[PDB]
Design an enzyme around this catalytic site. Sequence first.
Site, mmCIF file in Angstrom:
data_model
loop_
_atom_site.group_PDB
_atom_site.id
_atom_site.type_symbol
_atom_site.label_atom_id
_atom_site.label_comp_id
_atom_site.label_asym_id
_atom_site.label_seq_id
_atom_site.Cartn_x
_atom_site.Cartn_y
_atom_site.Cartn_z
ATOM 1 N N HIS A 1 -76.225 120.375 -64.233
ATOM 2 C CA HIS A 1 -75.989 119.067 -63.436
ATOM 3 C C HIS A 1 -77.022 118.023 -64.493
ATOM 4 O O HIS A 1 -75.919 116.947 -63.712
ATOM 5 C CB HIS A 1 -77.652 119.607 -62.420
ATOM 6 C CG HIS A 1 -77.444 120.175 -61.568
ATOM 7 N ND1 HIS A 1 -76.807 120.557 -60.397
ATOM 8 C CD2 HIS A 1 -78.336 121.553 -61.063
ATOM 9 C CE1 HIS A 1 -76.890 121.755 -59.283
ATOM 10 N NE2 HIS A 1 -78.058 122.057 -59.970
ATOM 11 N N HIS B 1 -77.656 126.040 -66.219
ATOM 12 C CA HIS B 1 -78.023 125.994 -64.775
ATOM 13 C C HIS B 1 -78.478 124.683 -64.816
ATOM 14 O O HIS B 1 -77.479 123.482 -64.006
ATOM 15 C CB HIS B 1 -78.384 126.924 -63.920
ATOM 16 C CG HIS B 1 -78.723 126.210 -62.321
ATOM 17 N ND1 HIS B 1 -77.434 126.858 -61.309
ATOM 18 C CD2 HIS B 1 -79.067 124.962 -61.796
ATOM 19 C CE1 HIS B 1 -77.789 126.072 -60.329
ATOM 20 N NE2 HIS B 1 -78.237 125.451 -59.850
ATOM 21 N N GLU B 2 -79.519 124.058 -65.131
ATOM 22 C CA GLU B 2 -80.175 122.497 -65.114
ATOM 23 C C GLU B 2 -79.261 121.939 -65.556
ATOM 24 O O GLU B 2 -79.207 120.884 -65.319
ATOM 25 C CB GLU B 2 -81.478 123.002 -65.270
ATOM 26 C CG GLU B 2 -82.378 123.143 -64.263
ATOM 27 C CD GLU B 2 -81.723 123.039 -62.881
ATOM 28 O OE1 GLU B 2 -82.344 123.634 -62.121
ATOM 29 O OE2 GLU B 2 -81.548 121.917 -62.874
ATOM 30 N N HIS C 1 -73.241 122.627 -57.587
ATOM 31 C CA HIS C 1 -73.145 123.621 -57.084
ATOM 32 C C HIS C 1 -71.813 124.600 -56.826
ATOM 33 O O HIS C 1 -71.137 123.875 -56.029
ATOM 34 C CB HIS C 1 -73.709 124.364 -55.682
ATOM 35 C CG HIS C 1 -75.525 123.940 -56.689
ATOM 36 N ND1 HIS C 1 -76.768 124.153 -55.695
ATOM 37 C CD2 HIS C 1 -75.874 124.547 -57.881
ATOM 38 C CE1 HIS C 1 -78.257 123.857 -56.641
ATOM 39 N NE2 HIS C 1 -78.151 124.328 -57.611
HETATM 40 N N1 LIG Z 1 -82.992 133.526 -55.686
HETATM 41 C C1 LIG Z 1 -84.302 132.627 -55.530
HETATM 42 O O1 LIG Z 1 -83.710 132.029 -54.271
HETATM 43 C C2 LIG Z 1 -84.945 131.957 -56.430
HETATM 44 C C3 LIG Z 1 -86.696 132.370 -55.999
HETATM 45 C C4 LIG Z 1 -86.781 133.542 -57.192
HETATM 46 C C5 LIG Z 1 -86.618 134.717 -57.743
HETATM 47 O O2 LIG Z 1 -85.810 135.663 -56.902
HETATM 48 O O3 LIG Z 1 -86.692 135.932 -58.923
HETATM 49 N N2 LIG Z 1 -84.924 130.623 -56.242
HETATM 50 C C6 LIG Z 1 -83.632 130.049 -56.001
HETATM 51 O O4 LIG Z 1 -82.907 130.296 -56.680
HETATM 52 C C7 LIG Z 1 -83.607 128.645 -55.824
HETATM 53 C C8 LIG Z 1 -83.790 128.250 -54.266
HETATM 54 C C9 LIG Z 1 -83.461 127.080 -54.164
HETATM 55 C C10 LIG Z 1 -83.107 127.327 -52.478
HETATM 56 O O5 LIG Z 1 -81.311 126.626 -52.209
HETATM 57 O O6 LIG Z 1 -84.021 126.329 -51.258
HETATM 58 N N3 LIG Z 1 -82.498 128.368 -56.599
HETATM 59 C C11 LIG Z 1 -82.740 127.399 -57.963
HETATM 60 O O7 LIG Z 1 -83.827 126.999 -58.240
HETATM 61 C C12 LIG Z 1 -81.376 126.980 -58.601
HETATM 62 C C13 LIG Z 1 -82.352 126.616 -60.456
HETATM 63 C C14 LIG Z 1 -81.075 128.892 -60.773
HETATM 64 C C15 LIG Z 1 -79.722 128.645 -60.336
HETATM 65 C C16 LIG Z 1 -79.205 129.948 -60.404
HETATM 66 C C17 LIG Z 1 -79.387 130.044 -61.916
HETATM 67 C C18 LIG Z 1 -78.346 131.530 -62.306
HETATM 68 C C19 LIG Z 1 -79.592 132.607 -62.669
HETATM 69 C C20 LIG Z 1 -78.347 133.510 -64.071
HETATM 70 C C21 LIG Z 1 -77.268 133.729 -63.265
HETATM 71 C C22 LIG Z 1 -76.297 132.823 -62.508
HETATM 72 C C23 LIG Z 1 -77.550 131.755 -62.427
HETATM 73 C C24 LIG Z 1 -80.820 129.648 -62.506
HETATM 74 C C25 LIG Z 1 -81.050 128.668 -61.753
HETATM 75 ZN ZN LIG Z 2 -79.110 123.321 -58.905
#
Ligand SMILES: NC(=O)[C@H](CCC(=O)O)NC(=O)[C@H](CCC(=O)O)NC(=O)CCc1ccc(-c2ccccc2)cc1
Ligand SMILES: [Zn+2]
Length: 159
Positions: free
Chosen positions: A118, A114-115, A124
């Site tokens: 970017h 993902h990173e 996104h």
């Molecule tokens: N689900 C969540 O909300 C998690 C928390 C951790 C968890 O649930 O284990 N945090 C996040 O998702 C934050 C949210 C930021 C926001 O908008 O405020 N996003 C980020 O930090 C972006 C990084 C990110 C996004 C998607 C994926 C991914 C992984 C597998 C398959 C497809 C995509 C990997 C890395």
């Molecule tokens: Zn992102």
Amino acid sequence: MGPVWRKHYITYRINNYTPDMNREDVDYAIRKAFQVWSNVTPLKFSKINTGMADILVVFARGAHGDDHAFDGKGGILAHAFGPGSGIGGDAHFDEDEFWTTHSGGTNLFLTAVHEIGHSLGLGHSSDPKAVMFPTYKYVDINTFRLSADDIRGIQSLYG
Ligand SMILES: NC(=O)[C@H](CCC(=O)O)NC(=O)[C@H](CCC(=O)O)NC(=O)CCc1ccc(-c2ccccc2)cc1
Ligand SMILES: [Zn+2]
Ligand SMILES: [Ca+2]
Ligand SMILES: [Ca+2]
Ligand SMILES: [Ca+2]
Ligand SMILES: [Zn+2]
């Protein structure tokens, strides 16, 4: 169309290593994450241990010298700058997360895919199957694949 690298040979360097994982496992996760994107574009990525890399990979905590402070465990997992000089392209991972090779904590490989998206210029996606979707959820690392939307996006920027 946002910024793109104006070359097809791109270097990266791992500035520092999370103590959460074996050093070898960090190297592997990062190399495999670049490979995901190299597999569908003309881009090639080489790791350097010295010199001036295009993409610096950093693990850091809280307020860490840029305008994208981290927030402790949970919430933001990482962030990255789009293509450009200096800080451009760099990918920062929040050390307050627990980085893993697996389904527990936060998987480094998946987050790095993902990173790096970017770092290469993608924003996104609203496609729930896309690696560029805004939220992380573990998916089987062995069957992981870019979605059609991810491939469309990156092929629109390069090649
Ligand atoms: N689900 C969540 O909300 C998690 C928390 C951790 C968890 O649930 O284990 N945090 C996040 O998702 C934050 C949210 C930021 C926001 O908008 O405020 N996003 C980020 O930090 C972006 C990084 C990110 C996004 C998607 C994926 C991914 C992984 C597998 C398959 C497809 C995509 C990997 C890395
Ligand atoms: Zn992102
Ligand atoms: Ca850079
Ligand atoms: Ca966080
Ligand atoms: Ca950690
Ligand atoms: Zn940062």
